[model samples]
Target chain A: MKQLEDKVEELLSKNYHLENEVARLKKLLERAEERAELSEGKSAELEEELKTVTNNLKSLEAQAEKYSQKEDKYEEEIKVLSDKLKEAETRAEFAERSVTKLEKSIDDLEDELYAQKLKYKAISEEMKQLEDKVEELLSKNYHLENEVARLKKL
Target chain B: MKQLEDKVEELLSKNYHLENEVARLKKLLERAEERAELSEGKSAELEEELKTVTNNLKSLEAQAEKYSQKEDKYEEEIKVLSDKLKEAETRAEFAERSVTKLEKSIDDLEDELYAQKLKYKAISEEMKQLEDKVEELLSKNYHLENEVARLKKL
Candidate 1:
């Protein structure tokens, strides 16, 4: 009877150990389920962030294309302006040449004018001398004519 | 034995987590390197473009200075030419006046020469008539003297 009682106590202790193991496994399973739910939530959040980033990238690409068009327009404008500047420079050069020609012509004309003025002065002086000589000749002729007339009367 | 098994499982899970984290950080580093290379290339290109622009601007400024100097020279020449032109106009006016005076002087000289020629002709005619009268009187006087001598002799 005493050996049988000891065997029954050993069986009860074995059953208690099995119950503890089962409780621990149940707790571990609950923790694993909670970790799976959190992983799923994080995946959904990452997917939404990826969509927003894609939309922003598309908008930036469109803006870059617009800027490229503007750059091409600016290049064309610069070319046109450069052509205009060259034309203006050529016009200025032509004007300078014309002024030089006008200066030469004017100088030549001035020299000719000075020579003519001197000639005019000489002619006037000659006319004055001729007038004085004529006056003296006329006075002598009048005196001689009066003497001749008086001798004829006597 | 159970404890040993739990420890092995924990080590395996920890190793997996560390490997995943390391892979994510490596991807992020690679992206950062790509961005840095792109920015460096753009910066180099912009620096070269700026250098070219600076050289172009300096050349344009030098050209502009040369053109301005030429313009100033042209202006000075134009001013001198304008003054010369005024002098030429005055000379032309004087030349026209001289032509008028010369014409009058020629007319007066011609008239004086014609008057002198007429007076010389008149003097020659008067001298011829006086010589003829003196010859006739000498003849008459000689004849009268001859008759008186004869009568005295008789």
Candidate 2:
């Protein structure tokens, strides 16, 4: 009976400690659960932030590509403009030379008039050709302007 | 080798999902650790609060016991006073009756003085007993008051 009573007391004390431990663990677990909930909220917030940054990067890349194409287009337009400017400069030099020749031809009469009329006709034809080329260059400039507008809109 | 080949596609898909999950879990674990640290602080605060409350409860329980004992002492004193008052009343009635007899027996004076002297002695004895009882109660009240003061300090 004495041994049994001692056993009972020991068991009772053990049970009490066990109960305390269980209660402590339960409280800790509740804290752990609260921690988990907080972690999940932070995770969701970070995921959203990551997604927004990724989307912004993609948009920036697309804009960069579009700007690169516009750069290329402008380069081509510059080249065309440079070629047309060169052609116009050449035509102006040729016109200046023809005017000088006509001034010289006035010193002669019958032969020079006949030569002057022929040179005048050639000058008119060259002027017409230069005008045509100018018109074509202006059209190309307009096309380049439209393309720049489109790129700006993009 | 056959099983490996058969499960290759499934393994690759699973591996891809697992990789994503692992990365997510790693980030989540970091957040969990931060949350746990914060909750640890709250838990420590709660534990301190609990300890203080338990100590207060112990002090209050001791105070309660002291108050109960004081109350019981008061009841005991009241009971003693009640008995003393009843005895005084009885003595007063007896003295009144003897004085009446003395008034009637004033001409027959020998026995009257003896009976009146006996009445005085009875009154003195009752006064002495009541005084002793009151003194005992006062001493007990003083001791109880000191004990209550000590407990209040605690």
Candidate 3:
């Protein structure tokens, strides 16, 4: 009977030890499962955030690409405008120089015209004096013609 | 005797069921622990990726902001250059008109000079004829004086 009791006691001890181990393991399992759920949620949240970041990055990349093309276009436009501005400025200078030279020519011609006018006026004055002298000579010649003819007749 | 045998069998049955329960709980605990470790590792990995993605986003944001400012600057520069090109072109036009007007003035002056020259030449020819007539008149006057003196002395 004592032996039976001893066997019974041993079985109880085994059961007791197994129950404790199972309880500890059950706590551990609970914690692990909870941590697994938390980690899964975190991973999902991270994936969602990554999706947002990636989309934002894609949008920014698209914008940057467009800006890059626009920058090249701006550079080309600036080059063309710079060249045109240079050409226009040069043309302005060229025309200004032409104007200056033309004005100088006009001034010289005006001075020459004034001189020509003075010379013409002087010549005209001389012609007037000559005409007056010619008139006096014609009058004297008429009187001389009458005197010479009368003396010859006599 | 039958009761003692039944008691032993009953004890055995209880121990058997408890042992089976403990074994099942142990297996469950092991699986839960393993799953927790896996989730922890996954969470850490996702956190690291999030850190990297965040950093990348910051960098891109900075870059895009810089590009935005540069685009504004480019626009302002383009405006200034456009205005300069326009002003330069207008100046060129103004200079061209001045040159045209100056050239026209020079042409008119040239025509006036030619006309003045022709008038002076015609007046000079007329003066030459008047001088010749005066010379003939003076010669006639001298001959009359000599003839009159000879007659008076006779």
Candidate 4:
């Protein structure tokens, strides 16, 4: 019976260690599952964020297209404005030349008018001198006629 | 001498049972240790996966930030493009109006040059209607673009 008692004690001691080990393993399993769950939750969050980022990237791509279109339009507008500027410059140059030509013509016309005015003044003085000579001849002729009348009367 | 012999047999029988019990406990201990070791290995694997998952989450967060910054830039670019579009549309409208007005003036001059062509027609009337239609269409286009912008805002 004492030997049997000794055997029972030894079994009890072994059982105790086994039970301890089992308890430890159970705790380890629980902790492992919790860790897995936490990691999975974090991964899910990251995935959701990735989805949002992808959508944002798509939006950015569309925005880039719109920007490119606008850039093209801007280039076209700049070209149009440049063409218009060149046309206006050409028109301005033509107008300047026309103004210069008109000014030259006006100067020539003024010179001709001055020459005509000088000729008219010289002709007016000559006409005055001829009138005086004709007056002198007419007076002389009158005197000769009176003398002839006197001779006939004598 | 007979009593001692009986005691010895009883002790031997007890010793055998004890040895059997000891053997059973040893097997239980071995199984418990195996289970503990398996749990520990699984826990270690979960920890490794968690580390990888954490690193992935960090990278994803960084990517998200980059995307957010890009999104902001896109928004600014879109805003600038929209402003440019509005300016271009205004210029287009002004150009259209100027062209219609110029066309009407040209028609009037043509009529004066050829009196036979002058039937007192309303030359500007058709051009004015065309201008109105163009302006209306441009306004409608602007409204639709605004709606698209609003939807994208969400």
Candidate 5:
């Protein structure tokens, strides 16, 4: 009975060690499953963020393209306006020159008109003196004619 | 001896049970190790993907910032150009008005010149007619003086 009791005690000890090992394995399995679950959840969250980031990148690229196109359009408009400004400046300068030339011509014409007016005044004075001389000669002729008629009557 | 045999039989059965429990524990440990290794590998792969995703997100964000800045610059340029366009248009309008006013003034001066020319011609013709009348009067005076001399001789 003592030998049997010793064998039974040995078997019990061995079974206890096996049960402990099984329990440890079970705990390890549980921990491994939990870690896997956490890792998968994190991966899913990262995938969602990546999806959003990709969408944002696509939108940004589109917006950048639009901005570039608008910039090009504005640059084209500036180029056209600059050309127009240059043309307008040239036209303005020409108009200014024309105005100056016209003013000079008008001034010269006015000067000529003033000289003509002075000449006309001098001629009018000379004409008035000639008219006085003609009036005196006509009166002398009338007196002489009457004297000649009286001599004929005699 | 029979008691010793029974005891041996009992120990043999207990050994068998222990051996079976040990086998079961070893299988459980192997399965746990396999699960842990798979989870770890999955976590490592997820971490690598997360690193790549994070890098992509940062790069996209930087690109987006650059695009935003470019858009702002374009908007500023557009504003400046719009102001310049308005100023240029006003200047062009002013220049056009000046040209029209100057042209009108020049036309009016030309008309005045035309009227002055007509007046000058009329005056010149009147002066020619007065000169012819003066010539006829001088001839008549000469004839009357000769007749007066004849009467005096008689």
Candidate 6:
């Protein structure tokens, strides 16, 4: 019976120890739950951040597409304008050649006209000499006719 | 002593119950720790995703800026080239006017040359008539002189 009292005391002490341990484990469980809540809260915050970043990425991509399209359209426009410029250059060259030919023709005509004017001046001088010869021959013919009439009278 | 043995048995049973509760608390603590780890992993995963999304968005923004600059440059080029083309057209108009003036001058010169040639032809015809008259007068003078000499001999 004295052994029985000692056993009761030991069991009571062990129970008390177990109660403390249970309380410690409860506190530990509560701490772990708080940690989990914190981690979960951070995860939810990151989820929101990801959503925002992804949405922004999509928006940026759309804007990039628009700019890329603009670049391509401008490239096409440049080619078109360049082609028109090329044609204008070609036409300008052709017109320049035509102007050269016309100027050459004018030079030829000028040369011909110059020669013609020289011939005209020489012909005018010969006309003056022929008119003077005509006057001298007329006077000689009148004197010879008068002498022929005098001889007939003799 | 029998009552002491009953008290010992009661304490032992209570201790056994406490031990079971401690085992349950340990299991709960382990479960809570595992939940925290899962939430932390999720947070890390979401964080990585956010970084990737942000990077992609930044890259797209840079690309969009480059394209915008390109579009602006091309627009400037188009305007410059178009202005050059306009100047080309203006020059062509000026050249066309020059050609018209040159042609008008050529027409005037041709008319003058034709008139000069006609004057030359008229002068040549007048010269031929005067020469024929002079030859006729010389033949008549010779006959009259012969008649005069015959009368003197008589």
- lDDT agreement with native, every candidate: 0.54, 0.54, 0.85, 0.56, 0.71, 0.85
Assess every candidate by TM-score: 0.47, 0.35, 0.84, 0.47, 0.77, 0.90
Candidate 4 lDDT over B1-154, as tens digits, reads 4564565566566655665655665565555556555555655665565566556556655655665576566556556655555555555555555555555655554444344223212333433444555555556555655555555555
Off by over 4 Å in 1: A1-154, B1-7, B150-154
Quick one: best TM-score, which candidate? 6
What ranges in model 6 sit over 4 Å off? A107-115
Regions of model 4 farther than 4 Å from truth = A1-7, A138-154, B1-154
Q: Residue by residue across A1-154, what tens digits does model 6's lDDT show?
A: 6777677777878888888999888888989999999988898888988888888888887877777777778889889988988888777666667778889989999999999989998888888888888899899989888888877885
Query: Clashing pairs in model 5?
Result: none
Candidate 1 residue-wise lDDT at B116: 53
After superposition of all CA atoms, the RMSD between model 2 and the true structure is: 79.4
lDDT digits (tens) for residues A42-151 of candidate 1: 55555555555555555555655555565555556555555654555455455555555555655555555565556545655654555554455455455544554545
Candidate 6: tens digits of C-alpha lDDT, residues B32-143: 8999999999988887888888888888877877777777788899999999888777766677777888889899889989999888889888888998998998888888
Q: Give the docking tier of candidate 6.
A: medium
Tens digits of lDDT, candidate 5, A15-126: 6676677677678667766766776676677667667766766776686678667768867876776676666666666766766776676677677667766766777777
Candidate 3, residues A1-154: lDDT per residue as tens digits?
7677677678778767877877777787788788888888888898898888888888877888887898898889888989999999999999998987888898899999999999988888888888898888888878877787777777
Cα-based lDDT at residue B94, candidate 5: 71
Q: Which stretch of 10 consecutive residues in model 3 chain B shows the poorest summed lDDT?
A: B1-10
User: What does the lDDT read for residue A65 in candidate 5?
Assistant: 78
Cα deviation of A57 in candidate 4 (Å)?
2.5
Tens-place lDDT per residue, model 4, A88-132, is: 555555555555555565555556556655655565565555555
DockQ values of all predictions:
0.02, 0.01, 0.59, 0.01, 0.35, 0.67
Local accuracy of candidate 5 as per-residue lDDT tens digits, B78-152: 677667666666666676677677667667766766776676677677777777877887788778778877777
Q: Please give the lDDT score for candidate 4.
A: 0.56
Candidate 2 — which residues are off by over 4 angstroms?
Answer: A104-154, B1-154
Interface RMSD of 4: 30.3
Q: Report the CA-based lDDT of candidate 1 relative to the real structure.
A: 0.54
Q: What local lDDT score does residue A123 receive in model 5, on the 0 to 100 scale?
A: 70
Worst 10 residues of 4 chain B by lDDT: B116-125
